[PDB]
Ligand binder design. Sequence first.
Ligand SMILES: *CC(=O)NC1=NC(SC)=C(C#N)C2(CCCCC2)[C@@H]1C#N
Ligand SMILES: *CC(=O)NC1=NC(SC)=C(C#N)C2(CCCCC2)[C@@H]1C#N
Lengths: 304, 304
Amino acid sequence: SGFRKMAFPSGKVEGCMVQVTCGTTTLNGLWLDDVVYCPRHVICTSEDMLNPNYEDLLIRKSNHNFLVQAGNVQLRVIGHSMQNCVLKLKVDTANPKTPKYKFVRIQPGQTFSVLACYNGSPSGVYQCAMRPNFTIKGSFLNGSCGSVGFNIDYDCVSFCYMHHMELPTGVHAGTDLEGNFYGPFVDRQTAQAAGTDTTITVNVLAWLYAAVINGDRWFLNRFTTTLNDFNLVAMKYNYEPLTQDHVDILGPLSAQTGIAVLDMCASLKELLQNGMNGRTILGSALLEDEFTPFDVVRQCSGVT
Amino acid sequence: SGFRKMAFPSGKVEGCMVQVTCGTTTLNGLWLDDVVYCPRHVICTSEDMLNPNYEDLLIRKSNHNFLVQAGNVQLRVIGHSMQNCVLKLKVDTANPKTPKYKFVRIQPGQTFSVLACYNGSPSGVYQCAMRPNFTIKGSFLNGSCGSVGFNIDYDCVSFCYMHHMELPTGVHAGTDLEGNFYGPFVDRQTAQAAGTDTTITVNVLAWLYAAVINGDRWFLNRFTTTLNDFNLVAMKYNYEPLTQDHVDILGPLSAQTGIAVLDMCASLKELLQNGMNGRTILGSALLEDEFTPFDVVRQCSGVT
Ligand SMILES: *CC(=O)NC1=NC(SC)=C(C#N)C2(CCCCC2)[C@@H]1C#N
Ligand SMILES: *CC(=O)NC1=NC(SC)=C(C#N)C2(CCCCC2)[C@@H]1C#N
């Protein structure tokens, strides 16, 4: 029993972290096979970030201008290319610590672990979600760009995120491992405002099921509702609309607890309309939306 | 910017996790050098746990009765000994993945990361604190016993906890790496009730400083207080008494923010007396007490 915001074990990603320096700018890189992936703005100075033309700045860079350090050993760069907002540095040595991996572009509401890094060295690991406005509420200081987000399925690491930017509001923006930003963000130091950070309804429901499984059941009420009625309430409280796909995804949690998805929806509806009344659910005084239904299943069943 | 419940990168501990089987009971072990550490109740059946005499049960066990599996390879057990509530299995092979390590017995209020494991395989990593009643609010399912808690300083892993038990209330109890339980707990399936789970005052203050550093400053008020006045309020709200040692430990946070420790104490006092009034601090609707002052410094400064 007990329910925690759990991140995946980070060792498989720790063994891929390198330092990438180009001129005076240094950031984190990800060494997978004989390639190093890093934000393309490793070729920029702080002044360049105001209005960078990456194609023009990259013309003035050769393989030897990129320094890649793995721990303390220097990897020889034998090729370089820009792919969207990431640079791919072909090195002469395959990473001996390359785990089984895939690059995945996740959907909003999906969760992943971030291995926060500075100078190619790992400092911490935390769990977070791709917000519905395509930002992440990370914890990143200067020097963390290039840190990646990932999920682990048995022995396979699915890299889903690379840290590139911090918006003026303190939220973070980045790309998948193909260099495409999540959301409408750009790698430029210009005012980029995020849209409404709505709550991930299916995740709140999933966490409400985990609460029931762990004995926190005070919030369970005597009512039910329909998807349309629930959605009218969810729209009022800036919650994402719930779909039949989300109901199907909640199926195993509904089966395990004996609580119909729409019955939990009605419980959530009353919580939105009345508040927690000074009470907690799983040690939280607010409704948690950064546990997907699969995260709850994994944590409540013990998937290694 | 951004503040997250961050755990240490777990790779150095992942490479030490083994499976220990004795008869039909299997739990997690920690392989450091040529020794494997695990809960002594690996020699017990579920019936034995009702009233075990470990010394008597251990007489009927030889080196060959303990099976140790590292990933999938079988380590040869060449010695065994009981040290308090842990068994030490001397194996014929030194762990090639042994990081730099120390065994430390932590004080209540201290935080550490837990690498939750099942069958010697890691499933997740989370951050938690040794509560003032010597329990931990972990997340452990059947098969997780033997999972360890640790802190990392540069390249050195300080192991501080080993999971041994779940109390009837859902909280967890365990030992340091010398087999001594934190608190008055015993490795017996008998009713053990925990004492008052009080709030770690110095950690709440430390998290209030992290909030100020990250821009959440609504709670800062126009008052100050004394240690004695603050402590009268802290006693009323089941908060630990704050000492001059705790004030000294908060010194760097006080220096960085320009907020005197007793001024933050007065802010905390008003928060205890009025509540949050529906507001959040660092995305939390309650006061967080599982970040030590050192954790805040590390996260807000970028220690790898
Ligand atoms: C996202 C990020 O922080 N980018 C960085 N840009 C630049 S100039 C394009 C930097 C420089 N020099 C640093 C790397 C060194 C520390 C200061 C920021 C980063 C990073 N990370
Ligand atoms: C702390 C804990 O869970 N202990 C266990 N005891 C016993 S009997 C002494 C077990 C058995 N058999 C298991 C290990 C296998 C899964 C069921 C529980 C554990 C554990 N862990």
